Amino acid sequence: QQLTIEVLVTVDGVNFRTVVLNNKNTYRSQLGCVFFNGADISDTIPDEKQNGHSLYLADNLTADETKALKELYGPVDPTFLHRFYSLKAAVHGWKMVVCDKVRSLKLSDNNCYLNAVIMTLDLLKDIKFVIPALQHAFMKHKGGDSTDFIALIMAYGNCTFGAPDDASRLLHTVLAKAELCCSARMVWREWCNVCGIKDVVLQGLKACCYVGVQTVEDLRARMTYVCQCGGERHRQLVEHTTPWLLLSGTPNEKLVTTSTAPDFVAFNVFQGIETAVGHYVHARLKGGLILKFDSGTVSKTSDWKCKVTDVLFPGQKYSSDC
Amino acid sequence: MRIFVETLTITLEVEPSDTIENVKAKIQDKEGIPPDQQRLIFFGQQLEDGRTLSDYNIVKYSTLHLILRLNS
Ligand SMILES: [Cl-]
Ligand code: NA
Ligand SMILES: [Zn+2]
């Protein structure tokens, strides 16, 4: 050819392989989709400068790289790695501001739902992620560097850069990949007039989340559905010990006031019409006031007429002989 | 195995080994709701695409609740 370089190729930053290249074809034709220092260089012709440099490979993986990719990220779809590399580059321009030691994501490219997701996640004690790459990015985020964690969340959530998205959906999809590092139990008593009574126990993190109610009064109320036998089966919470409680419902317009001494510690708000593009806001209760974190813009109020979606309560201690 | 999906309320014939994505494709087939816009809830848990109905202990005559993805 005309000149030869050697590059190092990785999908995890731990294991690298050497690939010999020339300047007669692009990276994509010789090797595949490659990122150099966070930038896609696949359609460029290799130059003597990049000799010895490292490249992150997003396709054309070898058998060993595919195994390592599964251990690092779990079972992902064929587009996941390229989407994660591209998101990470696109979210590079975002800013994570800190107001009185509270992290918050500035508004940009309709990312307000990510603001509510991140700040809700920052209030969850003792959560840890079971996907190693998701846990590594989490520690980075807790250490002040959120790029990987933001990008990974959007990749696992099938989120698109620039498009608005569902904060509650992404929060629970993220939480489905985590586990609790303490004790939590949730005992549901079920009974049908034909079959009888059976108690059902939920352990760990899933004992701390419920999608369908927004108050602990509705969580503890009696529910009714169809039994396997085909008749009325009932169900009710009879025991609950948690470090906290996340309840998520549809946008529900209520009046939130601090003169009533509310029991929850934080909540997310959906602003606008549900059949239109809405704007998410994260809110916390401090000093007998409502601290609204509108994507890097802080406010304080005593009352707020808003449509809540997620609500976060302190730990639960509950018993009920039903 | 018959289950109910509350949208109205309709009925699906499924297998315990069917994936959530497989269940979502049937809801699309009968209701025209694209799978990525569907949010399926059961026992207060959001069903993730990669897992099966058996993973969530979904049985005969179980009721799944359908929420639409906001914004989108
Ligand atoms: Cl009873
Ligand atoms: Na990268
Ligand atoms: Zn029965």
Residue numbers in the entry:
A (entry chain A): 1481 to 1802
B (entry chain B): 1 to 7, 11 to 75
Sentences reproduced from the published study:
Here we applied protein engineering technology to target virus-encoded deubiquitinating enzymes of two viruses with significant impact on human health: Middle East respiratory syndrome coronavirus (MERS-CoV) and Crimean-Congo hemorrhagic fever virus (CCHFV). Strikingly, coronaviral PLpros also act as vDUBs to suppress host antiviral innate immune responses by targeting cellular Ub-conjugated substrates. The CCHFV vDUB domain is located within the large (L) segment of the genome, and has also been explicitly implicated in the evasion of host Ub- and ISG15-dependent innate immune responses.
To reveal the molecular basis for the inhibition of MERS-CoV PLpro by UbVs, crystal structures of the enzyme were determined bound to ME.2 or ME.4. Substitutions common to both ME.4 and ME.2 at positions 46, 64 and 70 were found to promote more favorable hydrophobic interactions with the enzyme relative to Ub.wt. In comparison to Ub.wt residue Val70, UbV residue Ile70 extends further into a hydrophobic pocket of PLpro formed by residues Thr1730* and Val1691* (asterisks denote amino acid numbering of MERS-CoV polyprotein). UbV residue Phe46 inserts into a hydrophobic pocket formed by PLpro residues Trp1668*, Glu1670*, Val1680*, Leu1682*, Tyr1690* and Tyr1705*, and forms a cation-π interaction with Arg1715*. The UbVs also differ in their C-terminal residues at positions 74, 75 and 77. In ME.4, Asn74 extends into the active site and forms a hydrogen bonding network with Asp1645* and Gly1758*, which mimics hydrogen bonds formed by the same region of MERS-CoV PLpro with Ub.wt residues Arg74, Gly75 and Gly76. A superposition of ME.4 onto the Ub domain of a previously determined SARS-CoV-Ub complex suggests that Phe46 and Ile70 of ME.4 clash with Val188* and Met209* of SARS-CoV PLpro, respectively, and offers a plausible explanation for the specificity of ME.2 and ME.4 toward MERS-COV PLpro.
